[PDB]
Amino acid sequence: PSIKLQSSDGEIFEVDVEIAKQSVTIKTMLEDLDPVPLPNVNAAILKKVIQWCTHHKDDDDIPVWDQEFLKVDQGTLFELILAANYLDIKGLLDVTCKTVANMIKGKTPEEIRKTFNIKNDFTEEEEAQVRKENQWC
Amino acid sequence: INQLPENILLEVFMHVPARQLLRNCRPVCCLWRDLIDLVSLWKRKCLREGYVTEDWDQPVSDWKVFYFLCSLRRNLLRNPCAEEDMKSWKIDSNGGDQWKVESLPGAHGTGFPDSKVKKYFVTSYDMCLKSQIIDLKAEGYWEELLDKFRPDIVVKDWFAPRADCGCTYQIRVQLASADYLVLASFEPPPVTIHQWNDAKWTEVSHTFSDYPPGVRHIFFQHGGKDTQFWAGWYGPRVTNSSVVISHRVTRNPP
Numbered sequence: 001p002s003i004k005l006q007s008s009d010g011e012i013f014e015v016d017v018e019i020a021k022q023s024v025t026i027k028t029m030l031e032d033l034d035p036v037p038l039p040n041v042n043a044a045i046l047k048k049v050i051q052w053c054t055h056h057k058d059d060d061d062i063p064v065w066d067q068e069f070l071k072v073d074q075g076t077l078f079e080l081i082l083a084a085n086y087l088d089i090k091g092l093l094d095v096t097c098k099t100v101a102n103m104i105k106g107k108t109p110e111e112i113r114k115t116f117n118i119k120n121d122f123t124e125e126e127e128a129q130v131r132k133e134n135q136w137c
Numbered sequence: 138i139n140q141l142p143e144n145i146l147l148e149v150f151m152h153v154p155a156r157q158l159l160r161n162c163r164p165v166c167c168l169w170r171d172l173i174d175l176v177s178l179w180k181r182k183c184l185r186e187g188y189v190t191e192d193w194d195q196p197v198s199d200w201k202v203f204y205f206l207c208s209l210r211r212n213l214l215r216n217p218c219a220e221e222d223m224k225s226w227k228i229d230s231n232g233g234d235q236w237k238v239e240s241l242p243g244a245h246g247t248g249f250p251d252s253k254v255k256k257y258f259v260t261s262y263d264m265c266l267k268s269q270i271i272d273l274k275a276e277g278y279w280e281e282l283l284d285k286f287r288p289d290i291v292v293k294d295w296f297a298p299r300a301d302c303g304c305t306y307q308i309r310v311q312l313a314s315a316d317y318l319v320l321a322s323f324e325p326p327p328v329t330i331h332q333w334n335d336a337k338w339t340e341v342s343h344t345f346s347d348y349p350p351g352v353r354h355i356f357f358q359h360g361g362k363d364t365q366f367w368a369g370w371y372g373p374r375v376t377n378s379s380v381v382i383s384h385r386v387t388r389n390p391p
């Protein structure tokens with residue numbers, strides 16, 4: 001009892017509809033509408049999405065499955081949360097985001113800026129920004 | 138990473154421990170600092186953590202502080218119900234036969250009104266007093282919170298007699314400065330109760346509001362002795378003692 005989703009680059013994935021429904025933005029797509037197309041999702045992330053959605057087809061910490069599943073490289077993790085937002089799988093969004101927050105833990109204001117590579121925006125107001133709340137942490 | 142939407146960046150920040158999110162993630166860049174200091178971060182932290190229901194209905198002058206107070210809010214008294222024997226209590230006086238634990242309801246005693254409570258501390262024929270000295274900063278309550286906001290500190294204790302013997306209950310709870318100087322003192326009159334009583338458990342509770350600034354320790358002490366000079370444990374029984382710092386401040390500096 002299935003539907004066909006089609007990725008931004010053409011690849012068609014066939015899925016049962018109960019699993020596919022977890023994407024709000026294609027449960028709504030399905031109320032309107034031969035394979036439904038998703039041009040914001042390339043085939044690779046489309047699979048990791050349905051791979052996760054099938055794993056929670058019927059349902060604090062992070063599960064271990066969701067941890068091994070998310071042991072991907074950092075750009076795939078970011079595509080994954082953007083796909084989760086696009087598709088409105090509110091579960092996948094929280095697992096992937098929570099994961100990014102755990103990369104943030106333990107790192108300094110610079111060590112965070114390294115492992116994610118953003119450029120230093122302040123001038124010396126970092127002093128005004130660490131100490132502002134570091135006064136008591 | 139800053140490739141992400143503002144809403145999504147906020148959701149990541151939600152899952153970051155607040156003390157981390159403020160002293161590390163804020164000096165990363167303006168783009169981050171602006172978002173972290175956004176009230177809707179902390180509201181949604183409280184939301185997700187459960188501190189606030191969507192029918193919240195009660196104003197707060199500051200949600201960052203409010204979030205911490207709620208997260209820290211907890212009984213600072215260790216081993217309050219005699220489940221680890223006598224651990225982490227200091228025994229100021231241990232008279233007669235010693236301080237001793239006893240399962241409820243004990244001889245000539247009544248049951249404790251909370252089904253959760255099983256055991257109780259009990260005292261003997263001379264002065265038995267035990268205490269704890271809560272270092273407030275070590276428990277996470279930082280200074281400017283204590284002096285500039287002054288969240289209501291609430292203290293409770295429970296005590297019952299045996300029926301066949303009279304006794305006396307004493308309790309002192311003090312808020313002490315960094316110098317261990319007393320700045321507020323709950324010192325109710327001692328309670329003596331006679332022999333052939335109903336053995337009923339009784340809650341004592343007092344709320345410290347608008348205390349002076351400079352409280353760094355809450356010092357909690359209680360105990361008693363019987364008033365017939367009897368071998369054994371006919372002095373007062375105590376259990377379920379709590380100290381909790383609530384989210385209500387008396388002073389909203391903004």
Ligand SMILES: CC(=O)N[C@@H]1[C@@H](O)[C@H](O[C@@H]2O[C@H](CO)[C@@H](O[C@@H]3O[C@H](CO[C@H]4O[C@H](CO)[C@@H](O)[C@H](O)[C@@H]4O)[C@@H](O)[C@H](O[C@H]4O[C@H](CO)[C@@H](O)[C@H](O)[C@@H]4O)[C@@H]3O)[C@H](O)[C@H]2NC(C)=O)[C@@H](CO)O[C@H]1O
Nearest residue numbers: 233234243244245262300301302365366367368369370371
């Ligand atoms: C510090 C020191 O050494 N001081 C001693 C005193 O201890 C001693 O006085 C006696 O002390 C004991 C306890 O130390 C007392 O015994 C308790 O008595 C009550 C009841 O007392 C009367 O009432 C009953 C009628 O309802 C009668 O049955 C009874 O015989 C008495 O007339 C009991 O409730 C207690 O027993 C309960 O608890 C024990 C455990 O505590 C349980 O095993 C039992 O199941 C029971 O529930 C005690 O037995 C005793 O009364 C004291 N005696 C007197 C005469 O006062 C004193 C004697 O000189 O010396 C002091 O210096």
